[PDB]
Amino acid sequence: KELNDLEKKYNAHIGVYALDTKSGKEVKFNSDKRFAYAATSKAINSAILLEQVPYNKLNKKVHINKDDIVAYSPILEKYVGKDITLKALIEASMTYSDNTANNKIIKEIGGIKKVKQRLKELGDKVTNPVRYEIELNYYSPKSKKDTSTPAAFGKTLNKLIANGKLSKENKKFLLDLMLNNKSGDTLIKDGVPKDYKVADKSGQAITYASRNDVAFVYPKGQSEPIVLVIFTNKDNKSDKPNDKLISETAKSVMKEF
């Protein structure tokens, strides 16, 4: 189904970038338009850390104190005054979209500045990390803060994860978390065929019904994934998102492969 029709039906804006890493075939629709990426960036942050810490060293611990805690940290809030391994920081951020786990991960990498430097190195001059959780969710269409375009984000996920410098172990670890995440079930996972394995990370900013999902979709029989980025927003600050838009956009898009 035409994506413009999907936009029409949902009165939302859609940004898609799909890349079948086996063939190199790309599907694009508003792929160079900026969207607040929200929690989908957790995938990017976790992957950058895993480039620098071998699987075996994920047992290393970090101390968490009261200053680390930000809103919506279902796992990390129980860790004040305690220490936590890097493994569990990643599991929390990925599976529960723990905000404190994410910020901590960023801190471990060296700060936002270091994350930006690494995106530039991968050739991504678009994805613009500026704020930490949860401020990164205050999206304003008039601001480039914490936004990326589906094409940029999608090329970065491909380079970081689908075909980057991660070991076997750390790739499996990150992907298993994305495959089992129950939070993206009403999204990409909901619109692709049941044959398809979907490893995703969703996100939702506070404003303009900014709702997203990024995934590594593995068609039945294909070991190479298809990287799929779906960013969506609406015109009003207070609009609520309808997850069916992402489910349907994914369904349309999968027909191209």
UniProtKB/Swiss-Prot annotation:
GO terms for biological process: beta-lactam antibiotic catabolic process; response to antibiotic. Coiled coil: none annotated. The active site is at residue 39. Its EC number is 3.5.2.6. Substrate binds at residues 201-203. Keywords: Antibiotic resistance, Hydrolase, Plasmid, Signal, Transposable element. The keyword Signal applies. It holds the Pfam family LPAM_1. The keyword Cell membrane does not apply. GO terms for molecular function: beta-lactamase activity. The class A beta-lactamase family has a specific amino-acid numbering system, sometimes called Ambler or ABL numbering and often misspelt as Amber. A multiple sequence alignment was used to derive a consensus sequence and then the consensus was numbered taking into account insertions and deletions. This allows use of identical numbers, e.g. for active site residues, despite differences in protein length. UniProt always uses natural numbering of residues, hence there appear to be differences in numbering between this entry and some papers. NCBIfam families: bla_class_A (NF033103), blaZ (NF033139), blaZ_gen (NF033141). Belongs to the class-A beta-lactamase family. This is Beta-lactamase.
